[PDB]
Design a protein around this nucleic acid. Structure first.
Lengths: 154, 92, 99, 99, 127, 99
RNA sequence: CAACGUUGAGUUUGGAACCCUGAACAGACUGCCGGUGAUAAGCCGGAGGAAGGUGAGGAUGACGUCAAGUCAUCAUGCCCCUUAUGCCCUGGGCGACACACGUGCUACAAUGGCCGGGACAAAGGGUCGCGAUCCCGCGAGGGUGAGCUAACCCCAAAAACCCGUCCUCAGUUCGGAUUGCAGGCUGCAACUCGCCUGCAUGAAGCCGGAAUCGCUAGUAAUCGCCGGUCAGCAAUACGGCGGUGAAUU
C-alpha cells in the first residue's frame, strides 16, 4: 500500500453517451478479447429497453442496479486458529463492480435466445424483484448481519 | 483400409520369380517368405505362403477374396486377441 | 546503375569502412557513384538445449546477423576496373559482382 | 558417436555418388505418374538394386563426435558441441542474442 | 502543406493537412469506405478535429500501412494531433489536456522461451 | 410423406432433411439440386411431382447399412473384437468403439 | 514517393520531402517544484516531455545446497568382454494392453455454426531447393514451366473481425471421435507405422466431484502465420511473429 501506489486502470469511455463506469460492463461481458461484438450486447440492450420503460437508457440502468448493489459482504480472515467469517463494509468503487458480475452470470445462466434479450430481461427484473440477479443481493445479506458480532461498528 | 497405392503396387522380385517357376504345370504349395511389404498378385491362388513376423513363419492360405492386401496384415505383429496356439502354463 | 556489387559480412564497423573506400576511390576515377545505401538485415533466431539430458528449461539463443549493403557505380570505365579488381582488402567480407 | 556407427553411414554416402549420380535419372522417368495412361510396371517391378542404397537412409551426424540427433543444416554439428564452439570463438557471427 | 507522423504498435500513418472542404481520404479510399461495416473506432480518428473545430475547414490525405484496423485508427489520431501543432503553436494546451500528443508505449512483444504465452508458466503435477 | 425406407423427414428444409437418410451428407444434399433443379426452401411448400423426381435420385436405405458390414475377408481384424484398428492406445482411451 | 507531366498499375520521366531501411547522435539523472518524512534517504503527486522513477521487456542468475542429472554426446580412471556383451544383413520391435497418472488439443455453441461478399500484420524460409502463370482433376495433386540465388521471385489469398442472409438452442444446419469405399504424395519400400484428399457414417460431451494451475497491461484470454527437425510423419510438440484486447489488487 505504501510501496507502489496505483489508483485505478481505465480505458476509453462509453461510445457516444460518455461514461466511464458503464464502460466496465462492456469489459466484464468481454469474451476472449472481442470488444467489437461486446458493443453489440450492451448497445442493443439499450435499443430494446426503450419500449419496456419510459425514460432515458442511462437512468433505467442506474435505477435498476441499485437493487443488485450490495452494502456489506463476507471475507475470510483467520486469527488465533479458527477461521472467522468477518463482514467488512463494501464501498461505492467495489460495490458498483460487484453488481455487474451477478448480472453477467444471471444473463448467461438463462439459455433462452440471444444475449441481447438475456441482458435486457435481467435489467428490468431488478426493478420488480425477479431473476438470479436480484436474488444474490438478498443472499449475501443472509451471510452478513448474521455474523455481525465478528465485526465491530464504525 | 486404403494404403499407399498409385499404379505400381510393389511386389518383390524374389516373390513372383519363385511363384512363376511353380506356375509352369502347377506343383508345390509350401513357400517361405521374409518380405511383408509385397502385394498379392492374382496368380498366388491356392499357394500357402508362410510369412515372417519376427518370431516364426505362419502358414496362411490365399484365396480370390484377398487381392489388394499386403500379407503383413495377415501375420500378427504382437500377441493380442486372435488365432494362436494355447501355451503351456508354468508357475504363477 | 550498370555494375552492381553486394557486400555481405557479420560485424558492422568492418563493412562500413570498406564500402566507404569504394566511394572515395571510385569518384576520383571518372563517373559519379550512388552512396552506401543499406538494405534490411536478415536476422535469424533459433534455440537449442544446453544440458545433454532431461532439462527442457534453460535453453539458449544464437544470433547470426547478416548485415547487407549496396553501392552502385554509374559508368564502367577502364580506370575503375583497374582499381576495384586490385583493391582486394576484405578480411571477412564477400563481394558479389553482378552486371 | 561410435567409430563403428559413423563408418556404417559413411558407406551409405559412398554409393550416393555411384548409384544416385547418373543411374537414378533412369528410374525417375517411370516411377512418377505420367500424363498418359501407359505407365510401365517393368522398371518399378525390377527395382531390386537399391537394397542398402537410399537417399533417405542418410543421417547428417556431428562432424566432431557423430550423434544422429539435433543436427542443424547450417552448422552440421550437434547441440552440445555446437554450443562449445560458440561459447568460445570458433564460428563468425555467433554472438549473444536478445530477441 | 503540413506534415505529421504518428505511430501505434507497428502501424505508421503519414498525415498531410491542407485547407479545403473536409473529406477524409485514407489510402485512395474514403474514411467510411476503408473502415467499412460501421466500426466504432472510426470516431477516434475525428476526435483531434472535434475539440478544436477544424473538420469543416481542413481537408486531409493519409497513407496507412502496417498493424490492424484498430491499430491504424489510433495512428491517424496522433498524426493529426502532431500536425495541428505546426499550423499554430497556441493549439497545444487544449489538445495536450486529453493526451493526444502522447504516444501509447504499450506493445505486444516477444514470447519468452520455456513459457507458452510469454508470461504464462507451464503447470506441474500437484501433491 | 414416405421418401424412401423407414426414415421420414419432417418440418425442416431440404438441405438438411436428406441428411437423416444414409448415403447422403452435406455434400450430396447440394449435388441433388442440380439434376433435381430446386432451391434450399422448406419441405411443406412443394408439389406432388417434386417428391417423385426426388425419389428417383437415390433410395438405398437399410441395404446401405448392409454394405458397411459387407463381407469379412481374411483381415477386418480388431473389428470382430472391438478395438481402434489403427495406432491408438486402447489401454486408457477409445470408448468410441467399446461399450 | 508530397509537388509536377499520368498506358491508373508509381506505371514512366523525375523528385528525396515523408514512410520504411541501415549505421551514428541526442534523451529521465528524482534532475526540477511541492507535500509527507528526523531541515537525510526515500515515498506520494505535479510540471515539462514520445518515454520517467531500476521506462517495457531480454541477456546476464555470487560464495554455495541436493556426493541432484549426464561416463548413450564427447573425453577419461578402473573393471570386464576381446572366432566376444565386436562386426554385417533381413524381418520384427520402441506409436504393444484389463487399468492408473501428467502435460496438451478439439467441443458441449448461437458474444455460435454455415453460405456469399469483403478490410488491415509482423516475423521468417528457400539452389540433391521456394516454386508463381496456364492446362487438367470435386480435391490432395499432377503436366508444362517463368522468375528469385533473393526488402526485385516464390512460400500466403492471415485469421478473428465485418455487411447481408439462414438457423433460431431439439445432442441441434454444435461436435467431430470412429467406421466403410475410392484416391493422391513422399521413398527399395510405408500391413504392423504414415500424412493428406474425396464420399458416407457420425458417438462421447450440454462446462465436469475432492483437489488444483497460470496470469496484474497490452499481461490474461483468444485468433492466424512462420521457422528449426525433415524425403515424408504440414493448427494439435518446441521455438519464433503479429491481430484483437480485459478483470482485480
Amino acid at each position: 500500500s505504501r510501496r507502489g501506489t496505483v489508483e485505478e486502470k481505465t480505458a476509453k469511455s462509453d461510445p457516444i453517451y460518455r461514461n466511464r463506469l458503464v464502460n466496465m460492463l462492456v469489459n466484464r461481458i468481454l469474451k476472449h478479447g472481442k470488444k467489437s461484438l461486446a458493443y453489440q450486447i450492451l448497445y442493443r440492450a439499450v435499443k430494446k429497453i426503450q419500449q419496456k420503460t419510459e425514460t432515458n437508457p442511462l437512468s433505467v440502468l442506474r435505477q435498476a442496479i441499485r437493487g443488485v448493489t450490495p452494502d456489506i459482504a463476507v471475507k475470510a480472515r483467520r486469527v488465533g486458529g479458527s477461521t472467522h467469517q468477518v463482514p467488512i463494509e463494501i464501498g461505492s468503487t467495489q460495490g458498483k463492480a460487484l453488481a455487474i458480475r451477478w448480472l453477467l452470470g444471471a444473463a448467461r445462466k438463462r439459455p433462452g435466445r440471444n444475449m441481447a434479450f438475456k441482458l435486457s430481461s435481467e435489467l428490468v427484473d431488478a426493478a420488480k424483484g425477479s431473476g438470479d440477479a436480484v436474488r444474490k443481493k438478498e443472499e449475501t445479506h443472509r451471510m452478513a448481519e448474521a455474523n455481525r458480532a465478528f465485526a465491530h461498528f464504525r | 483400409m486404403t494404403r499407399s497405392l498409385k499404379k505400381n503396387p510393389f511386389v518383390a522380385n524374389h516373390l513372383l520369380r519363385k511363384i512363376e517357376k511353380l506356375n509352369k504345370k502347377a506343383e508345390k504349395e509350401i513357400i517361405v517368405t521374409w518380405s511383408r511389404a509385397s502385394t498379392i498378385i492374382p496368380t498366388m491362388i491356392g499357394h500357402t505362403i508362410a510369412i515372417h513376423n519376427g518370431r516364426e513363419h505362419l502358414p496362411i492360405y490365399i484365396t480370390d477374396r484377398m487381392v489388394g492386401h499386403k500379407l503383413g496384415e495377415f501375420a500378427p505383429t504382437l500377441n493380442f486377441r486372435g488365432h494362436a496356439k494355447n501355451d503351456n502354463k508354468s508357475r504363477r | 546503375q550498370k555494375i552492381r556489387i553486394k557486400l555481405r559480412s557479420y560485424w558492422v564497423p568492418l563493412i562500413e569502412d570498406s564500402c566507404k573506400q569504394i566511394m572515395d576511390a571510385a569518384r576520383t576515377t571518372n563517373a559519379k557513384t550512388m552512396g552506401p545505401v543499406p538494405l534490411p538485415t536478415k536476422k535469424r533466431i533459433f534455440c537449442v538445449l544446453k544440458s545433454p539430458h532431461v532439462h527442457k528449461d534453460a535453453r539458449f539463443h544464437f544470433e547470426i546477423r547478416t548485415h547487407q549493403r549496396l553501392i552502385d557505380i554509374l559508368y564502367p570505365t577502364a580506370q575503375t576496373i583497374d582499381s576495384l579488381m586490385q583493391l582486394d582488402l576484405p578480411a571477412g567480407v564477400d563481394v558479389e559482382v553482378k552486371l | 558417436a561410435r567409430k563403428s556407427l559413423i563408418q556404417r553411414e559413411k558407406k551409405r554416402r559412398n554409393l550416393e555418388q555411384k548409384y544416385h549420380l547418373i543411374r537414378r535419372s533412369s528410374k525417375q522417368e517411370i516411377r512418377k505418374v505420367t500424363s498418359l495412361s501407359d505407365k510401365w510396371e517393368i522398371h518399378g517391378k525390377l527395382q531390386s538394386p537399391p537394397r542398402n542404397s537410399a537417399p533417405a537412409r542418410l543421417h547428417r551426424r556431428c562432424f566432431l563426435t557423430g550423434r544422429p540427433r539435433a543436427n542443424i543444416r547450417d552448422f552440421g554439428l550437434s547441440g552440445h558441441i555446437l554450443r562449445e564452439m560458440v561459447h568460445t570463438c570458433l564460428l563468425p557471427g555467433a554472438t549473444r542474442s536478445s530477441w | 502543406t503540413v506534415i505529421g507522423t504518428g505511430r501505434r504498435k507497428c502501424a505508421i500513418a503519414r498525415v498531410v493537412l491542407q485547407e479545403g472542404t473536409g473529406k477524409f481520404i485514407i489510402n485512395y479510399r474514403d474514411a467510411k469506405e476503408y473502415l467499412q461495416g460501421n466500426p466504432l473506432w472510426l470516431q477516434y480518428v475525428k476526435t483531434p478535429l472535434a475539440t478544436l473545430g477544424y473538420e469543416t475547414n481542413y481537408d486531409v490525405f493519409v497513407k496507412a500501412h502496417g498493424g490492424g484496423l484498430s491499430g491504424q485508427a489510433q495512428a491517424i489520431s496522433l498524426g493529426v494531433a502532431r500536425a495541428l501543432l505546426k499550423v499554430s503553436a497556441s493549439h497545444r494546451a487544449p489538445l495536450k489536456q486529453e493526451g493526444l500528443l502522447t504516444r501509447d508505449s504499450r506493445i505486444v512483444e516477444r514470447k519468452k522461451p520455456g513459457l507458452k504465452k510469454a508470461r504464462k508458466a507451464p503447470q506441474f503435477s500437484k501433491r | 410423406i414416405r421418401i424412401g425406407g423407414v426414415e421420414i423427414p419432417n418440418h425442416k428444409r431440404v438441405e438438411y432433411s436428406l441428411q437423416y437418410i444414409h448415403g447422403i451428407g452435406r455434400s450430396r444434399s447440394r449435388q441433388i439440386l442440380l439434376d433435381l433443379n430446386f432451391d434450399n426452401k422448406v419441405t411443406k411448400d412443394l408439389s406432388e411431382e417434386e417428391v417423385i423426381i426426388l425419389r428417383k435420385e437415390k433410395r438405398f436405405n437399410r441395404v446401405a447399412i448392409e454394405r458397411l458390414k459387407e463381407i469379412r475377408c481374411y483381415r477386418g481384424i480388431r473389428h470382430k473384437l472391438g478395438l481402434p484398428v489403427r495406432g491408438q492406445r486402447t489401454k486408457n482411451n477409445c470408448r468410441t468403439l467399446k461399450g
